[PDB]
Amino acid sequence: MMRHLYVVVDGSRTMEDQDLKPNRLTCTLKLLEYFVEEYFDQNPISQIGIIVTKSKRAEKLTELSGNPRKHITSLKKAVDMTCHGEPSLYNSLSIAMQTLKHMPGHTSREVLIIFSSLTTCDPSNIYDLIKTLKAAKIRVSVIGLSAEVRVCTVLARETGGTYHVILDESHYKELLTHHVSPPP
Amino acid sequence: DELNLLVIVVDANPIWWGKQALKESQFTLSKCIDAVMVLGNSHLFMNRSNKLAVIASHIQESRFLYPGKYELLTSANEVIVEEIKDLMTKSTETLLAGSLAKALCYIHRMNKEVKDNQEMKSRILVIKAAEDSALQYMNFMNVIFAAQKQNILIDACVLDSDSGLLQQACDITGGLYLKVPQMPSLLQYLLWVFLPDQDQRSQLI
Amino acid sequence: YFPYDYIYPEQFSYMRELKRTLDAKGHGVLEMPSGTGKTVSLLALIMAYQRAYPLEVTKLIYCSRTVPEIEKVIEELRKLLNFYEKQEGEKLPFLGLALSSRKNLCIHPEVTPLRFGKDVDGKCHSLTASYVRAQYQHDTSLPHCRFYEEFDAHGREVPLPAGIYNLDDLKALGRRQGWCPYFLARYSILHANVVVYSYHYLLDPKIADLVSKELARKAVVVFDEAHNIDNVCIDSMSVNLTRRTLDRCQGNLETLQKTVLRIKETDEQRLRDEYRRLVEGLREASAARETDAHLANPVLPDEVLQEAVPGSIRTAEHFLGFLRRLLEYVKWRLRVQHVVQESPPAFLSGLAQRVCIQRKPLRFCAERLRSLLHTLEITDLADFSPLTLLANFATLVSTYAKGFTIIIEPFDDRTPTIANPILHFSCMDASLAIKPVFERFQSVIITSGTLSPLDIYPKILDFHPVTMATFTMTLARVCLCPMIIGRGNDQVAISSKFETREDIAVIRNYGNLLLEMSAVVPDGIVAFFTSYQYMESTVASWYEQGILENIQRNKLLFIETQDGAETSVALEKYQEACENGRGAILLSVARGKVSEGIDFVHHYGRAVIMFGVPYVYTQSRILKARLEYLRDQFQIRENDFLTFDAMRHAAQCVGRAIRGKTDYGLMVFADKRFARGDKRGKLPRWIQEHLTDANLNLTVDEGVQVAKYFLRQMAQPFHREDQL
Ligand code: SF4
């Protein structure tokens, strides 16, 4: 059951706000460093990639691959990110659509959205991507952070993934640990 | 002050000793048990703070044997003779599979129990006399992976003829593979293993 | 008995409550914990009483207060119909009549798309029973109101229509086979089970709209969301009059003079013959829809008398009595509108000293006005309506004013100079409009999501056997969080106790709260304000000063405006902006109509802020006449009823937030004055179960941390609840 995960991290100014380690990207980044390491500890047959949502954009940061050191070095460099601009889910799902339309669909394609639950600022109606990716069968599971956004709920309910929000950093580990195991 | 463990596995195949009962050099069962005795006695001869444990994997079970230097080794000797007699009175891949499962869980227990600075190295050795069959591919594999994920070196020695899974154990984990024709020569080279390949695998050989 | 799943439980409560209201034939006051689908339980147990008969005569007229909620009631009982129509197997017929008169009327394209209701229905009735009743058969004159004649045909016949219909069900049937809402409403009033319509339709003594035949043996009526009973009765019987309106009336009188002069015999000989027929026998000359298009009864339990036409011999002299009435009345108006007065019998008795005839033509001016145009049957209703207003006023002033008042107020009501003069004639007895509704029926049920102080039932004065505060536990751990926001830190004046808008540091703390509120809270926020003009002040200090853009850094403002168009635009934007990526807070006014009907459900607008106190502004003299007549009831009331109506506005606004148990409810009172005022008016179950453990003087930032904890712990879980 081979997976092709693009972890979508957020870079809004919700990463200036605390209730975690000194900036939320620090906790999220550190536990993504754990996530990469455990995701190759469990899933060598799969492949990951970092997409960082930034300044109403999304930016592909590491390709869909099976070489962990590049991922972790990308994390090390994304440590000191200023996190300019409110995010955008639309660009992240567009990037995932582009790069993942070409993969063979006998395998599960989830996409992990680590979204900071800030206002979903998009130039185009994401409801239409929620229409398309249903038929495409690319799955999407989303972990918000400190709030429940309605649109992520509709996203995670039509796509068929899982949504969750987090208080304890121990609980953040609980949920990343849940997403480690391969969903059917 | 490396709180160092050593764990050993011995086959208990009566078919294999029936093979080794018509031979010309004719090392006995008790010869190999004395070999392992000397292995353990040598590693505890190294320092007080070193501990150790040995199994003999029974056809039906696996019972472990573990222990003023001389008296420590003598208690070990008596324990070893007693459960070796128990194995010879109470009697293929199942034996040693379930034994290495016991082994890892006993490493878990010995690690969880007595740690003070939580400092440790849980090195394990394996001696398999006969072949190990692929009727349980998943179990053996799983155990090797659990051994790697516990940061444990697995060394190994084969006596009669080669098996796949032991070679693959050696490969995946990071401990050496061994097979020597002449058998007391292999006993003293196990002694060379327990000394160098256990302590200072570094600049040795 | 319709559970369809396992309940809150509420049917465990309202089953026993309704069995108590139906054993003892009595009135009753219910209270809804707002997460209840009160509609489901009420409609269900009422239908359970419909299909049984411990009493053989069994009715329901059920109301609501907004035209969408009518449709909401409909669909939910369509669901109710469906379920144990399937379960009970063999189907027995049904009817629920949404009786919408005004804007849900006409299928003719010439008539329909003119915007208002009343005037265009005047064009409709002028065509039907004024042009095609006078010119009773013509090609060009009698226009194609063809399905009124189809009503003639099937009103001679007997069909049986199917079940409860929508509003648009009857327009689609208009197209196919059920044509007029009015006339198929008549034929279906002839036999119906449940009739649902608007609350203003049933209690309106400007034009007393007799709904059903007043068959006083057995009759069951339920008032839904029934909070503003007093203000409905008052505004349904008060009458306002403007001097501009009076000058349109004077132009209209000169127009009627022209029409009287240009008619020499024919309609007037018709009047003479029919008036001889009326002297010979007291008869209803228009049995059909004209009396429904007339001002029916400005005084309902007062008689349609015997001494009809007391002071008139012919038309133009009674017209001269109206001319005297208007000229003397504008004389009255100028000489009194010098300085505002308050008097019930002084104006009527002094006019009885000025105008010749006293108390009989005052008692018949409405009917004689309507009948003397009915014999003419030429004047357009749009051109005529302010004279209808006048005769309706004089009829009221005639037969009623002892509990009523007259108040005449020709000056500023937040305005420029004396160029808008106007009077008001209101009750203050809420009894004199609800007493009909009690005395007619077997039992009515006042339902409320809000009515916590049951000690201010006696503004209605009546008698009431079933009166309990509904208790319903919430194992969906905490459905609410009231969180009252009085600054410890920045030294709260969040109450507007200086004046309405005499200071603005008040408003700057409000904007601090709003920005941090929009920082935390998702999905749009429903921001209730104090008044239009205070919201104008707030928004002025916001969009002028340092605030607003950081809110506009986050989300979008939907600022209400005093039309229905801007209500529509901001509402459409609110739902379409919260069902997408964006928050976009609404900010409205508490007494503005956005509260009634909209139902901010959990998908959008899930954290309702009250800002300020929803008190009606405390110095106005209508309110002083009100509180003096209720100081004629209890003498403590001078601040007590103010706090009462402030609380019913408050909870009516705030307690829309929740539709179910499994639902997310914040409600935060950015106020100071809410200590004992919300240990009065918030629901007592809600103060006991969910409210103000230690939360009274919450600094905003403490409020934000309480909000974070609440949102995070409502967003963490869900499986298990009160499986009852
Ligand atoms: S009666 Fe029915 S059709 Fe004729 S005017 Fe009124 S609505 Fe239009």
C33 assigned ligand-binding residue? yes
> Within 10 Å of residue C429's Cβ, how many Cβ atoms?
22
Give exposure, A122-159, as e/b (b: 16+ Cβ within 10 Å). Answer: beeebeebbeebeebebbbbbbbbbbbbbbbebbbeeb
Backbone angles phi, psi at C270, to 5 degrees: -60, -45
Tell me which CATH code domain A4-180 carries: 3.40.50.410
CB contacts of C716 in chain A (<8 Å) are 164-167
Which residues lie closer than 8 Å to C181 by C-beta, 6 or more apart? C99, C100, C101, C104, C105, C170, C171, C174
Ligand 1 close to Cβ of residue C108 (< 6 A):
yes
What's the token pair of residue B75? Answer: 């208690």
Rg (CA), chain C: 28
Using alpha carbons, select from A73, A69, A64, A72 the residue that is nearest to residue A107.
A64
Length, in residues, of chain B: 205
Nearest by CB to A119, which of C554, C714, C715? Answer: C554
> Within 10 Å of residue B200's Cβ, how many Cβ atoms?
9
Q: Is B177 helix (H, G, I), strand (E, B) or coil?
A: strand
Q: Give, as one character, the DSSP assignment of residue C467.
A: B
Per-domain residue ranges for chain B? 3-196
A167 touches chain C (CB under 8 A): yes
Ligand 1 close to Cβ of residue C332 (< 6 A):
no
| Cβ contact A146–C714 (<8 Å) | no
Q: Do the beta carbons of residue C455 and residue C647 sit within 8 Å?
A: no
| Cβ contact A120–C554 (<8 Å) | no
The distance in angstroms from the start CA to the end CA of chain C is 14
Question: How far, in Å, CA of C219 to CA of C214, rounded?
Answer: 9
Q: Do chains B and C touch (3 or more CB pairs under 8 A)?
A: no
C704 touches chain A (CB under 8 A): no
Q: What share of chain B is helix, strand, coil (3-state, %, to 5)?
A: 50, 15, 30
Q: Experimentally, how was this structure solved? A: cryo-EM
| Cβ contact C715–A89 (<8 Å) | no
| Cβ contact A148–C715 (<8 Å) | yes
Q: Do the beta carbons of residue A38 and residue A71 sit within 8 Å?
A: no
Query: Atom 3 (ligand 1): residue with closest C-alpha?
Result: C106
State in Å: Cα C177 to ligand 1 middle.
15
Q: Do the beta carbons of residue C95 and residue C105 sit within 8 Å?
A: no
CB contacts of A119 in chain C (<8 Å) are 554-555, 581-583
Distance from the Cα of residue C98 to its chain's centroid: 16
Using alpha carbons, select from C684, C473, C379 the residue that is nearest to residue C12.
C473
Question: Within 13 Å and on the Cβ side, how many CA atoms surround A118?
Answer: 27
> What stretches of C546-699 show up as alpha helix (H) in DSSP?
548-554, 565-578, 621-631, 637-654, 684-689
Ligand 1 atom with least separation from CA of C182: 2
Using alpha carbons, select from C178, C109, C175 the residue that is nearest to residue C144.
C109
- Assigned architecture for domain C480-715: 3-Layer(aba) Sandwich (3.40)
Q: Do the beta carbons of residue C626 and residue C686 sit within 8 Å?
A: no
Ligand 1 atom with least separation from CA of C124: 5
C593 touches chain A (CB under 8 A): no
Which residues lie closer than 8 Å to C38 by C-beta, 6 or more apart? C10, C14, C30, C32, C224, C447, C449
Looking only at Cα atoms, what is the longest distance across chain B?
Answer: 52
Ligand 1 close to Cβ of residue C130 (< 6 A):
no
Angle between helices C181-189 and C167-175 (to 10 degrees): 110
C520 touches chain A (CB under 8 A): yes
Nearest by CB to C712, which of A121, A126, A167? Answer: A167
Q: How far does the CA of residue C603 sit from the closest CA of chain A (Å)?
A: 7
